[PDB]
Amino acid sequence: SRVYEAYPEKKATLYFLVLGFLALIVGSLFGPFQALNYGNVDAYPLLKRLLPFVQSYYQGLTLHGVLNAIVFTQLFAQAIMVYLPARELNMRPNMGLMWLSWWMAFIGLVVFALPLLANEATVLYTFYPPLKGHWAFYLGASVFVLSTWVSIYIVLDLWRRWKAANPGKVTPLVTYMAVVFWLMWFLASLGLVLEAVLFLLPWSFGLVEGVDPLVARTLFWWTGHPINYFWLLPAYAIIYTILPKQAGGKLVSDPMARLAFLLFLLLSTPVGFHHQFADPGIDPTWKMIHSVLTLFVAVPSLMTAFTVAASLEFAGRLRGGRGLFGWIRALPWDNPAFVAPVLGLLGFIPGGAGGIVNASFTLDYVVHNTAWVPGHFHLQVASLVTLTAMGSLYWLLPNLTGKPISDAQRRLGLAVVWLWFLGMMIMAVGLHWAGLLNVPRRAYIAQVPDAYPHAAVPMVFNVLAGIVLLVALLLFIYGLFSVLLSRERKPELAEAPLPFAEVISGPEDRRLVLAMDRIGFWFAVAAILVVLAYGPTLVQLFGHLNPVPGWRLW
Amino acid sequence: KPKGALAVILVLTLTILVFWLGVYAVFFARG
Amino acid sequence: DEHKAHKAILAYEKGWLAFSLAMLFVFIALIAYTLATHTAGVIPAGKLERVDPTTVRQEGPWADPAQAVVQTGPNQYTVYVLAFAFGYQPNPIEVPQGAEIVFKITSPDVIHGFHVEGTNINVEVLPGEVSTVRYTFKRPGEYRIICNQYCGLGHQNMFGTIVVKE
Numbered sequence: 021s022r023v024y025e026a027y028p029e030k031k032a033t034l035y036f037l038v039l040g041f042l043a044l045i046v047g048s049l050f051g052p053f054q055a056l057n058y059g060n061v062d063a064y065p066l067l068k069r070l071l072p073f074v075q076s077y078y079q080g081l082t083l084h085g086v087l088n089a090i091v092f093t094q095l096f097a098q099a100i101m102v103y104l105p106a107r108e109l110n111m112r113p114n115m116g117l118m119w120l121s122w123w124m125a126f127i128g129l130v131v132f133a134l135p136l137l138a139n140e141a142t143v144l145y146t147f148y149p150p151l152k153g154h155w156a157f158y159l160g161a162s163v164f165v166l167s168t169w170v171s172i173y174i175v176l177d178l179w180r181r182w183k184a185a186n187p188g189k190v191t192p193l194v195t196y197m198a199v200v201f202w203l204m205w206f207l208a209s210l211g212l213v214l215e216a217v218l219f220l221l222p223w224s225f226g227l228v229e230g231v232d233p234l235v236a237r238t239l240f241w242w243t244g245h246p247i248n249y250f251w252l253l254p255a256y257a258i259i260y261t262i263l264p265k266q267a268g269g270k271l272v273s274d275p276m277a278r279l280a281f282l283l284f285l286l287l288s289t290p291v292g293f294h295h296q297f298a299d300p301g302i303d304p305t306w307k308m309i310h311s312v313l314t315l316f317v318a319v320p321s322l323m324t325a326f327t328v329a330a331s332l333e334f335a336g337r338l339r340g341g342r343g344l345f346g347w348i349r350a351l352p353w354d355n356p357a358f359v360a361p362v363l364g365l366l367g368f369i370p371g372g373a374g375g376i377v378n379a380s381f382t383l384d385y386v387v388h389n390t391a392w393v394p395g396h397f398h399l400q401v402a403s404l405v406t407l408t409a410m411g412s413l414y415w416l417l418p419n420l421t422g423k424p425i426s427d428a429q430r431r432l433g434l435a436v437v438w439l440w441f442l443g444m445m446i447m448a449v450g451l452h453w454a455g456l457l458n459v460p461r462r463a464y465i466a467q468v469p470d471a472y473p474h475a476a477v478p479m480v481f482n483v484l485a486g487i488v489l490l491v492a493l494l495l496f497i498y499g500l501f502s503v504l505l506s507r508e509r510k511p512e513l514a515e516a517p518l519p520f521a522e523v524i525s526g527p528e529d530r531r532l533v534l535a536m537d538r539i540g541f542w543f544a545v546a547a548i549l550v551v552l553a554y555g556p557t558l559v560q561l562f563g564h565l566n567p568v569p570g571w572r573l574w
Numbered sequence: 575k576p577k578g579a580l581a582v583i584l585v586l587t588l589t590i591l592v593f594w595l596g597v598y599a600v601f602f603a604r605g
Numbered sequence: 606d607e608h609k610a611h612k613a614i615l616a617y618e619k620g621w622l623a624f625s626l627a628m629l630f631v632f633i634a635l636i637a638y639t640l641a642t643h644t645a646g647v648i649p650a651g652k653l654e655r656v657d658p659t660t661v662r663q664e665g666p667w668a669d670p671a672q673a674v675v676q677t678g679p680n681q682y683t684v685y686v687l688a689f690a691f692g693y694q695p696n697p698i699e700v701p702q703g704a705e706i707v708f709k710i711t712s713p714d715v716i717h718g719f720h721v722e723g724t725n726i727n728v729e730v731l732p733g734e735v736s737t738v739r740y741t742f743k744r745p746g747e748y749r750i751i752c753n754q755y756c757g758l759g760h761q762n763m764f765g766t767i768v769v770k771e
C-alpha cells in the first residue's frame with residue numbers, strides 16, 4: 021500500500037515476526053509430547069504417524085530447542101529491537117541492510133533445517149562435541165546467528181544519525197535500550213562465533229579429526245548465557261516503554277530503566293561458568309567468581325521487578341483502584357496485550373528464584389542436568405518472553421498490517437494467553453519437583469517407565485500441563501491465522517502510533533542519565549570485564565588442547 | 575508509599591527465600 | 606501527586622535495591638561457607654588431567670575394572686570410572702562407608718553425566734578429560750548413578766550402580 025512506501029520498516033519487521041511465530045508453531049508442536057513424556061506417558065507413536073520424518077524423541081527435542089529458543093526468540097529480538105527504536109526516533113532503518121538480515125536469517129534457517137529434518141543432526145541446541153552434526157547444521161546456524169550482526173549495525177547506524185542531527189542531546193529511552201542491547205549482544209556472540217569458526221566448522225567439514233570438548237563448552241557458554249538476556253530484553257523494552265501505556269498509567273522512572281539495561285550490558289557476559297559448575301579442568305576460584313558475578317546480573321531484574329510493579333500499581337491507582345489489591349483489579353484485564361506480559365511477569369517470580377538457586381555454585385549439584393532446569397527456564401523464556409511476544413500480536417500487528425482485531429478475536433487471545441500461562445505454571449510444578457526427585461533432563465523417561473517410581477505425583481502435573489498446553493497451542497495456531505489471513509484492512513491502523521508510554525513527571529538525575537549516555541565508555545568496560553573474567557581460563561585451555569573423535573550415536 | 579509494589583517484592587523475596595533455603599537444606603542432606 | 610508518587614516510588618525503590626543487595630550477599634557468605642566444609646568435595650578438581658579416549662580401555666587404570674578401586678590412603682580409596690555408551694565400568698563400584706572416595710571418571714566416546722542418586726555427586730564427564738570429585742558415603746547400601754547429559758539414543762537407559770559396604 022501507500023503505507024509501506026513511507027514505512028518499509030513495517031514490512032521487514034512483519035516478516036521477522038511472522039517467520040518467528042511459524043518457527044514457534046513448529047517448534048512447539050513437540051512440546052505436549054515432551055510434557056507427556058515427563059509424566060511417564062509415551063505418545064510418540066501417534067506423533068510419528070503424524071510427522072513421519074521424526075525418528076526419535078531426541079530429534080524432536082532438537083527441533084523444539086533450535087526453533088523455539090534460538091530461531092523464534094531471535095527473529096522476535098530482531099523485529100522488536102530494530103523497529104521500536106526506529107519508530108521512537110522516527111527515522112528509517114537502512115532498508116538495504118534490514119532486508120539482507122531477513123534473507124540471511126531465513127537462508128540460514130532453511131539450510132540448518134535440512135539436516136535437522138533429515139535426522140542428520142540430532143545434537144540438541146547445545147550441540148556438545150564430540151557428538152557430530154552435519155556441516156549444514158553448523159553453517160546454517162552460523163549464518164542464522166550472524167544475521168544479528170547486521171542488526172547490530174543497523175541500530176548503531178540509526179543511533180549515530182540521530183546523535184548527529186541532535187548533538188548535545190541524550191539518547192532517547194527505547195533507542196538507548198536497543199543500543200546497549202545490541203552492543204552487549206556483540207561481545208556475547210564472539211564466544212559462539214569463535215567456537216564455530218575455530219572448531220565446529222572445520223570439524224564438521226572434515227578439516228580436522230576431532231574437537232576439544234572443554235574448550236567448545238567454554239566458548240559456547242561464553243555466548244550461551246547472555247543469549248538468554250538477548251531473548252529477554254526485547255520483552256523488557258516492551259514491559260518498560262509500552263506496557264505502562266496499555267495498563268492505564270506511565271513508566272515511573274526513565275533513569276531506573278536505563279540503569280537496568282546498562283547493568284545488563286556490563287553483567288550479562290562474564291558469567292558463563294555458572295553453566296560449567298560440573299565441568300572438570302576449570303578452577304573452582306573461577307566458578308566462585310562467575311557465581312558472584314551471576315548474582316550481580318540478577319540485580320537489574322530485581323530492580324526491574326519493583327520498577328515495573330510500581331508502574332503497574334500507579335496505572336492501577338490511576339484507574340480508580342484503591343486498597344492494596346484494588347489497583348490490581350483496576351488494570352485492563354479485558355486487554356490481552358496487557359495480560360500476556362503481566363502473566364509472564366508472575367511466572368518470572370518463581371523462575372528467577374529458580375535462577376538464583378542455580379547460580380549458587382555448590383547448590384547447583386542438587387539440580388544440574390535434572391528436570392528442575394527445564395522447569396526453571398520455561399518460566400522464563402517459554403512464558404515471560406513468549407507471552408510478551410504473543411500479546412504483542414494484538415497491538416503490533418494492526419500497527420504493521422492495518423488488519424484490525426475483532427472483539428471475538430480479542431477474547432480468543434485471552435484464552436490462549438491464560439491457558440499458556442496456566443499450563444506453564446503446571447508444567448513448572450511437575451518439572452521442578454521431578455528434578456528434586458533426581459529425574460534427568462533431556463531424557464525419553466517414558467521408555468524406561470519403571471525407572472522413576474518416586475515421581476508419580478509430579479508426573480500427573482506433567483501430563484496435565486501436556487494436554488492444557490496442547491489446547492492453548494491449537495488455539496494460538498487457529499487465532500494467529502484468523503488475523504494473518506484476515507479479509508478486511510484499515511490503513512489508519514498502520515498509521516496510528518505505537519502505544520509508547522509517558523514517563524512519570526518528577527525531577528531526575530540528569531547526571532546519571534548523562535553518565536549512562538557515555539556508551540562508548542561502558543561498552544569498553546563490559547569488554548574488559550570479559551577479557552578479565554574469561555581471559556585466563558581460555559588462555560590455559562588453548563595452552564593444553566586435547567581434541568577427540570566425533571560420534572554420531574543416533 | 576507504593577504499598578502494592580512493596581507487596582509484590584514481598585512475594586518475590588519470600589519466593590527466592592523459600593527456594594534458596596530449600597535447596598540449601600537439600601544440598602546438606604545429600605552432603 | 607504525580608511529582609509526589611515519583612519521590613515515594615524512588616524512595617522505596619532505594620530501600621528494596623539495598624535489601625536485595627543484602628540478601629544476595631548473605632548467599633555469597635552462605636555459599637563461601639559450603640566451600641569450606643566437606644560437602645565441597647564434590648566440586649570438580651579444576652586441574653587439567655588429559656587422557657586419550659581411544660586407548661583408555663587398553664592401557665591405564667580404566668583398562669581392567671576389577672582393579673579400578675585402590676586404597677590411596679589410610680581411610681581413602683580412588684576409584685577409576687569409565688562412563689561410556691551406554692553404561693559404567695565397573696558395575697558395581699564397591700567402596701566402604703566412612704571412607705573418603707576419590708572418583709576419577711572419564712569417557713571413551715561422547716560426554717556423560719555421573720549423577721549419584723541420593724547425593725551431591727553430579728559431574729559432567731568429557732572424553733579426554735578426567736574428572737576428580739570426592740565424597741564420603743555416610744550410609745551403606747546401593748546408590749544408582751544416572752546419566753544426566755544427552756549421549757544419544759540409549760541416554761535414558763544408561764545407569765550404573767554403587768555399593769557402599771557396612
Ligand code: HAS
Pocket residue numbers: 146248249251252294295314315317318321322324325326328329332348362365366368369371372373374375376378379380384387388389393397400401405582586
Ligand atoms: C530468557 C531466559 C532466561 C533468563 C532470564 C535467565 C535468568 C537466569 N538464569 Fe537461567 N540459569 C542460570 C542462571 C540464571 C539466573 C541467576 C537468572 C537471573 O537472571 C534471574 C533474575 C530474575 C529475577 C530475580 C526475577 C525477578 C522477577 C521479576 C522481574 C518479575 C516481577 C513481577 C512483577 C513486577 C509482576 C507484578 C504484577 C502484578 C499483577 C502484581 C544457571 C546457573 O547459574 C543455569 C545453569 C544451571 C544448570 O545446571 O543448568 C541456568 C540455565 C538456564 C537454561 C538452560 C540452558 C541449558 O539448556 O543448559 C536456560 C535456557 C536459561 C534461561 C534463562 N535464564 N537458564
Ligand code: HEM
Pocket residue numbers: 044048049050051052054055058081084085088089092093144145146394398401402403406447460461462463464485486489493
Ligand atoms: C508448547 C509448550 C511447550 C511445552 C509443553 C514445552 C515442554 C518442554 C519440556 C517437557 C521440555 C524438557 C524435555 C526434556 O528435558 O527431555 C522442553 C525443553 C525445552 N524447551 Fe520447551 N515446551 C514448550 C514450548 C517452549 C517454548 C515456547 C520455548 C522457547 C521459547 C521452549 C524451549 C525449550 C528448550 C530451550 C528446551 C531445552 C532443550 C534441550 O535441553 O536440549 N519451550 N519443553
Ligand SMILES: CCCCCCCC/C=C\CCCCCCCC(=O)OC[C@H](O)CO
Pocket residue numbers: 583584587616617619620621624
Ligand atoms: C531473612 C529475613 C526475612 C525477611 C522477610 C521480609 C523482608 C522485607 C522485604 C522487603 C523490604 C524492602 C524495602 C524496604 C523499604 C524500607 C524503607 C525505605 O527505604 O523507605 C523509607 C522512605 O524513604 C520514608 O520516606
Ligand SMILES: CCCCCCCC/C=C\CCCCCCCC(=O)OC[C@H](O)CO
Pocket residue numbers: 602631635638642
Ligand atoms: C545487621 C544484621 C547483620 C546479620 C545478618 C546475618 C543474618 C543471618 C545470616 C547468615 C548466617 C550464616 C551462618 C553460617 C553458618 C552455616 C552453618 C550451616 O547452616 O551448616 C550446618 C551444617 O550442618 C554443618 O556441616
Ligand SMILES: CCCCCCCC/C=C\CCCCCCCC(=O)OC[C@H](O)CO
Pocket residue numbers: 449452453456457600603604722723724744745746747748749
Ligand atoms: C511444589 C513443589 C514441591 C516439591 C517437593 C519435592 C520434595 C523433595 C524431596 C527430596 C529431596 C532430597 C532427597 C535426597 C535423596 C534421598 C535418597 C536416599 O535416602 O537414598 C540413598 C541410599 O541408597 C540409601 O541406602
Ligand code: CUA
Pocket residue numbers: 689690691716717718752753754755756757759760761763
Ligand atoms: Cu550417557 Cu546420557
Ligand SMILES: [O-][O-]
Pocket residue numbers: 244245248
Ligand atoms: O540461561 O540463564
